[PDB]
Amino acid sequence: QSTYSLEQLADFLKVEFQGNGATLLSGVEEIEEAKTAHITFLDNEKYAKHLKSSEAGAIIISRTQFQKYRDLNKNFLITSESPSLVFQKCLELFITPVDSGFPGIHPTAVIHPTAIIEDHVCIEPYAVVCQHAHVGSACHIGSGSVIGAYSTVGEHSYIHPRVVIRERVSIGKRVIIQPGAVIGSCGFGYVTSAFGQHKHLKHLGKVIIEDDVEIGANTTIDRGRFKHSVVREGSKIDNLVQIAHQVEVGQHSMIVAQAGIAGSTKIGNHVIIGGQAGITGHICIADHVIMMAQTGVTKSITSPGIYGGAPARPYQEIHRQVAKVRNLPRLEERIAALEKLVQKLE
Template identity: 40%
Template sequence: MRLSELAEAIGVDFSGEECEISGLGTLKGAKRNELSFLDNPKYIKDLATTEAAAVLVSPKYADAVPEGTAALVDEEPYLKLALASAFFAPVPMKRSGAKPLIGEGSEIAENVAFGKDVVVGRGVTIMPGCYIGDEVRIDDDTLLYPNVTLYNRTIIGKRCIIHAGTVIGSDGYGFAHTKEGKHVKLHQLGNVVIEDDVEIGANCAIDRGTLDATVIKEGAKLDNLVHVAHNCEIGEHSLITGQVGLSGSTKLGRNVVMGGQSGTAGHLEIGPFATIAARGGVTKSIEGGKVYAGFPLMEHKRWLKLNALLSRLLEKKK
C-alpha cells in the first residue's frame, strides 16, 4: 500500500515523502519498504538504527525517529499497528501453487493433507492425520507422529521428532486494546523456525512470531504440554519439561533447564546454563549459570533457607 493510503486507513496523520509499504517489521529487522512501531521503551535503542520506511510512535518519542524514516505519530501506536496488520495478513489457504515436493525415501501416510509449495526432504516420515500448511519446509530424516499440525511457512530442520497432537505456527496471543475496552487482533505475520535435532513432545503449542520468527534452536528438547508464545527464542540444547509456559519475546540462552509448570513473564532473557526449578516464576531477566526457585524467583539455596525459616516459625507458634 501507499504509505499515505495506509495512514489514512488506520487514522493517522501523515505528511512527508510518499513510498510503497509492502509489510510490517520490527525496529531492528524492518526493511526500507516496511512499517515498524515503538510502543515498549525497552526498544528505544533500536529506533535510532532502524531502516524502516516509517514508524508508528507516540508523541514523546517522535523526535527520536531517525532522518529518512517517516514518523507516524499517534497516542496509541500499538493499536494502530494492529489495524495496519490486517492489510498484510496472509490468506489462510493459497489457491494456487506447486504440489508438494517430496524427497527420496520419505514415507507419507495416505491421509496427510498438504498445502501449496511444500518441500519435504529425504527420509522424512509423516504419520496419519498430519496437516502441512503452505510453504512449509521439512528437512531430512524428520519424524512427525499422528495429528501434528504445521501452519504456513513453518520451517523444520533435520532429524527432528515431533510427537502427536502438537501445533506449530498457530497465532500468537496478540491484541491491542481500545480505550473502550475492545480487543483488536494483531495479525501474526511471522513464522516458526525449528533447527536440527529438536524433539517436541505431545500436545505442545508453539506460536508463530508477530513480525519475525519464533525460534527453537539446535538440540532443544521440549516435553509434553509446553506452550511457547510468539517471538520466543529457545537456546541450543535447552530442556523444557511438562506444562512450562513461556510468555511472548522470552529469550533463553543455551542449555537452560526449566522444571515442570515453571513459567516466564514476557520480554525478558534467561542466561545460558540457568536452571529454573519446578513452578518457578521468572518475572525479570536473570543471569545464567545458577539454579533458581520459587515465586518471586530467587536462587535455589536462598529459597530452601526461606522455607526452612517459615517452617520453624510455624513450629514456634504451636
C-alpha cells in the same frame, strides 16, 4: 526374544566384566526391581543405596561408582561411558520397534500440486501437504498430520500422527514432533481498543525449528507478529508446553512438561526449564540456568545455577526461605517467651 550370558554380553558392549560370567539373562529391568534373569544400571549417587542388595544378574556401573562397591559378590559390567547409554544398548537387544503398516505415500494423502516431496519419504493415510511445501528426503509424515503452505520439513525428521504444522514453518534436520503438537499457531496479540475491546492481528512471522530438536505431544508454539520464533538446535521440549510468539529457545536446552514461556523471551543455551514452570515475557534467561518445577521467573536471570520458587530465587535462598517459613510457629513462641519476661516493673 533370546538369552545372553554375562561374558557374552561384555564383548558385544565392549565393556569389562567382573563376577560369575556364566550368568544367563533374558530381559531388562531397573535396579530396585531386577531379577537374576534381568540386566540393570547405576549412574547416580542418590540411587546407589539400592545396589547393596540387588538380585540382578548384570549391573552396568561406571569406573567411579565401581570403586565403592567392587568387593560385593554381584555381577558387574564396568564402563568408562555413561551407564545409561550402555544400558540402552542392552534394551535395544530385547524389544523391537513397530511402524503403522502403511509404508511410503498412502493413496489418500492429499498433496498440493505446487508442493515438493523428496525421495524416500513416508506419508501415512489422510495427511495433507499444502501449497509450495517442501517435505525433505527420508522424512515421516504421520497419519492425518498437516504440513502448512510454504513450510519446510528438513531431512530425516519424524512427524507423528495428527500434527498441525502451519504456514511458513522451517523444520530442521532429524526433528521429532510427537502427536498433536501445533507449530506456528497465532501469537496471543491484539489491538487494545478504546471501548476496552480486542481486535485480532494476523501474525505472519516465521517459526524456525532447528536441527535435532524434539517437540512433545500437544505442545503449542506461537509465531511472532512479524519477527521469528526460534527453537535452537538440540533442544528437547516435553508435552503440553507453551512457547509464546517471538520466544527464542537457545541451543541444547530442555523444557519439561507443562512449563510455559511468555512472549518475546530469550532462553539461553543449555537451560533446563522444570515442569509446570512459568517464565514471563520480555526477559532474558542466561546460559546454563536450571529452573525447578513450578517456578515463577518474573525478572531476567543473569547468572547460571539452580533457581526455584515464585518469584525465582537461587536454590540455596529458597531452601532456606521454605525452612524459615516452616519455622514461623517456633519463632512466634520465642516472641511469647520474650513477652513473658517483660513483667518488668522495678
